[PDB]
Amino acid sequence: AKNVVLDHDGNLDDFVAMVLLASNTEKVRLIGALCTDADCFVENGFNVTGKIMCLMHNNMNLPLFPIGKSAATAVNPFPKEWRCLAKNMDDMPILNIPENVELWDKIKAENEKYEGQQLLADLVMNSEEKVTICVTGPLSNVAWCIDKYGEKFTSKVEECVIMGGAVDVRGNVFLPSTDGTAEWNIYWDPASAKTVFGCPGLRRIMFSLDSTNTVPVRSPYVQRFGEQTNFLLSILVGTMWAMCTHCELLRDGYYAWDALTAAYVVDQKVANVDPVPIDVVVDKQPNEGATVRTDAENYPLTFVARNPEAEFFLDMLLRSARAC
Amino acid sequence: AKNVVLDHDGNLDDFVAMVLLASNTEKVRLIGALCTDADCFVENGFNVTGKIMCLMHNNMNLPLFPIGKSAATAVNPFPKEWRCLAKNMDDMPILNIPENVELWDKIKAENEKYEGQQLLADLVMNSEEKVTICVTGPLSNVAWCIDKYGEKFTSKVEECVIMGGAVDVRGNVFLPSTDGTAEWNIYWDPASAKTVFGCPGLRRIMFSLDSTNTVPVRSPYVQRFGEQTNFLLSILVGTMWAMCTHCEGDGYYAWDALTAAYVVDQKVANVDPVPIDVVVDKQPNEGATVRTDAENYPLTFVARNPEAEFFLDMLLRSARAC
Numbered sequence: 001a002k003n004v005v006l007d008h009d010g011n012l013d014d015f016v017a018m019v020l021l022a023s024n025t026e027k028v029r030l031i032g033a034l035c036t037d038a039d040c041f042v043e044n045g046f047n048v049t050g051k052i053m054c055l056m057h058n059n060m061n062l063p064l065f066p067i068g069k070s071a072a073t074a075v076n077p078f079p080k081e082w083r084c085l086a087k088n089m090d091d092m093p094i095l096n097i098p099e100n101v102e103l104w105d106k107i108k109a110e111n112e113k114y115e116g117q118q119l120l121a122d123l124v125m126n127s128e129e130k131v132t133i134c135v136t137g138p139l140s141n142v143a144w145c146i147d148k149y150g151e152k153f154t155s156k157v158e159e160c161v162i163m164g165g166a167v168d169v170r171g172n173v174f175l176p177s178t179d180g181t182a183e184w185n186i187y188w189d190p191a192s193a194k195t196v197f198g199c200p201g202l203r204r205i206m207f208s209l210d211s212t213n214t215v216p217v218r219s220p221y222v223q224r225f226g227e228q229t230n231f232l233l234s235i236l237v238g239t240m241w242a243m244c245t246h247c248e249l250l251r252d253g254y255y256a257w258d259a260l261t262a263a264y265v266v267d268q269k270v271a272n273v274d275p276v277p278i279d280v281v282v283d284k285q286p287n288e289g290a291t292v293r294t295d296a297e298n299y300p301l302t303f304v305a306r307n308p309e310a311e312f313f314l315d316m317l318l319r320s321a322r323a324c
Numbered sequence: 325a326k327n328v329v330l331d332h333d334g335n336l337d338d339f340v341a342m343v344l345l346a347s348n349t350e351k352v353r354l355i356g357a358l359c360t361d362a363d364c365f366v367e368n369g370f371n372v373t374g375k376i377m378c379l380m381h382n383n384m385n386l387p388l389f390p391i392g393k394s395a396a397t398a399v400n401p402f403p404k405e406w407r408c409l410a411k412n413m414d415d416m417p418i419l420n421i422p423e424n425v426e427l428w429d430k431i432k433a434e435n436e437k438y439e440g441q442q443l444l445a446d447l448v449m450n451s452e453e454k455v456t457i458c459v460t461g462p463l464s465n466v467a468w469c470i471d472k473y474g475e476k477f478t479s480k481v482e483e484c485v486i487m488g489g490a491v492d493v494r495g496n497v498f499l500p501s502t503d504g505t506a507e508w509n510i511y512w513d514p515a516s517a518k519t520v521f522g523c524p525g526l527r528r529i530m531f532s533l534d535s536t537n538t539v540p541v542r543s544p545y546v547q548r549f550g551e552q553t554n555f556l557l558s559i560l561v562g563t564m565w566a567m568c569t570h571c572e573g574d575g576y577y578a579w580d581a582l583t584a585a586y587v588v589d590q591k592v593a594n595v596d597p598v599p600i601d602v603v604v605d606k607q608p609n610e611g612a613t614v615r616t617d618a619e620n621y622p623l624t625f626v627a628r629n630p631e632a633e634f635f636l637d638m639l640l641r642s643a644r645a646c
């Protein structure tokens with residue numbers, strides 16, 4: 001098993017990613033998580049992270065790990081409607097079994113003292129073997145680590161597997177002021193994204209909308225978790241996905257963005273990758289936050305996922321959700 | 325037990341209402357349900373109704389009953405975001421257990437065949453004993469039955485217990501063209517509501533915002549269903565309420581659940597007689613329930629001072645039925 005840190009922002013697929021990574025102990029040793037106040041309210045995202053970890057700890061061989069709240073602040077905040085989803089999860093019966101919440105109450109004081117960005121730096125740099133960072137929220141925390149420590153940090157990173165951006169497809173940031181070319185995670189903090197994508201000593205795997213568009217969250221698949229209600233993780237993952245399926249009345253859509261990214265960490269058969277030099281628009285233009293190809297000399301490459309193995313991924317998630 | 329039909333529009337509390345009615349078999353015999361394309365997409369609301377009924381049949385021996393979709397159309401439709409909540413429920417693991425889905429698939433065609441409004445008329449008029457209609461969506465279906473059958477329908481109704489309106493508090497319909505005094509269920513179809521509230525020979529109990537304001541859905545209580553995860557209905561009820569705790573006129577309350585609780589046990593609230601008219605003209609208070617001065621106007625019993633602790637305990641206990 002390789003050391004993994006999950007750097008997330010507490011939306012529903014962030015938690016599905018957490019389950020995928022935590023549950024696959026043969027492949028992934030989850031040595032820590034951090035939550036960013038982006039696509040969630042950080043207090044809720046933090047609490048749900050702990051509640052999931054404690055459910056799993058009490059029911060399978062998952063060692064406890066540190067969880068930190070990131071101090072990162074938004075350049076462009078998410079819609080408030082979307083940020084509420086961690087609050088809903090915090091209140092779910094499946095996450096509020098007394099034995100699990102008793103454990104969380106007991107270990108919370110240790111965890112709420114961590115500063116998330118410093119926690120990320122420390123876990124990566126003090127690991128004996130290299131650490132893979134699965135980034136499923138904005139790139140603020142990795143950039144912070146880069147700015148503070150440079151090569152002392154990046155030399156200890158196995159690779160960054162990042163959910164973010166949109167290269168040869170439309171983005172998903174549709175606002176009166178935007179032209180729709182940007183993806184949300186990058187748009188939340190373009191400058192941090194620019195630091196990460198332009199970093200010369202960092203290996204990056206990028207799950208942009210180019211690949212994630214191929215795995216929308218759809219009812220017939222989600223209903224399969226109903227076949228598995230004896231498993232706590234299937235009640236958990238199925239419940240989260242059920243809140244993400246396409247309501248027939250609506251005409252933006254939900255995909256397995258972060259879950260696919262985590263699935264790749266578990267097994268790289270999930271997608272092939274193409275080397276692309278990725279720069280980021282940081283200026284306050286309609287295309288702020290866009291990830292664009294650059295032909296600048298000596299620009300570092302990023303390995304952009306393509307043609308993901310959707311069935312393989314969907315089967316992986318369903319099986320992982322039977323870990324307990 | 326007394327005969328009850330649930331006339332609902334498929335939002336989360338509509339389904340909590342259904343669980344309360346269905347689980348309290350000592351008090352309530354649920355003889356049918358209707359779903360209206362108001363605060364849901366009716367196909368989703370229909371499926372969730374069936375899926376809940378089938379789970380409860382397999383786990384607590386709840387007798388199966390007809391479920392019909394109403395052809396009623398909106399005067400003023402609900403916001404689309406709010407209507408999507410039944411879609412989420414339709415895909416919930418708890419509602420998609422093979423034995424329960426297999427039963428639903430087996431009986432779905434029979435239920436698809438009903439026209440919901442006619443079904444409500446028939447269930448009521450063909451029953452040996454009188455029937456209590458618990459209305460948790462708009463009043464379109466009760467009005468349709470009144471319009472078509474009149475006294476032949478109303479004489480078979482024990483009482484209507486209705487979630488709707490706002491009497492001495494503001495409403496919850498906040499739009500550029502409104503003054504905020506109307507409540508959504510009435511606003512969706514004011515003319516139908518007027519028909520119901522003005523109908524003679526029909527006993528009406530009214531859960532307006534005056535009473536329902538006392539029961540906002542809040543995290544501490546919701547989390548208590550976590551204590552009862554051995555019970556399918558506690559996973560079900562807890563999950564639905566957990567989807568409501570963030571809400572922020574957008575605030576979520578146990579509106580329909582309190583209404584159904586009263587059907588189970590009238591100690592949930594005392595009532596006061598009020599003659600209720602409904603504004604139907606296209607004015608800022610369109611859909612408002614107001615006191616009318618009309619001579620010999622029929623009374624409606626408006627709920628007052630609900631017993632919140634009693635309700636909360638009832639729901640936690642009902643969610644242990646299976």
Ligand SMILES: OC[C@@H]1[C@@H](O)[C@@H](O)CN1Cc1cccc2cccnc12
Pocket residue numbers: 011012013014039082136137163172183184185252253254257258
């Ligand atoms: O842009 C995709 C990122 C992913 O990391 C995932 O957590 C959701 N997130 C932002 C996002 C984009 C588009 C639609 C959304 C709807 C609800 C919540 N987040 C959304």
Ligand SMILES: OC[C@@H]1[C@@H](O)[C@@H](O)CN1Cc1cccc2cccnc12
Pocket residue numbers: 335336337338363406407460461487496507508509573574575576579580
């Ligand atoms: O006006 C209250 C009625 C109840 O029957 C309940 O099912 C919801 N419904 C409409 C409604 C009103 C106010 C806020 C809401 C938020 C989400 C969904 N419905 C709402």
Ligand SMILES: [Ca+2]
Pocket residue numbers: 008009010011013014039136137258
């Ligand atoms: Ca995310």
Ligand SMILES: [Ca+2]
Pocket residue numbers: 332333334335337338363460461580
């Ligand atoms: Ca309703």
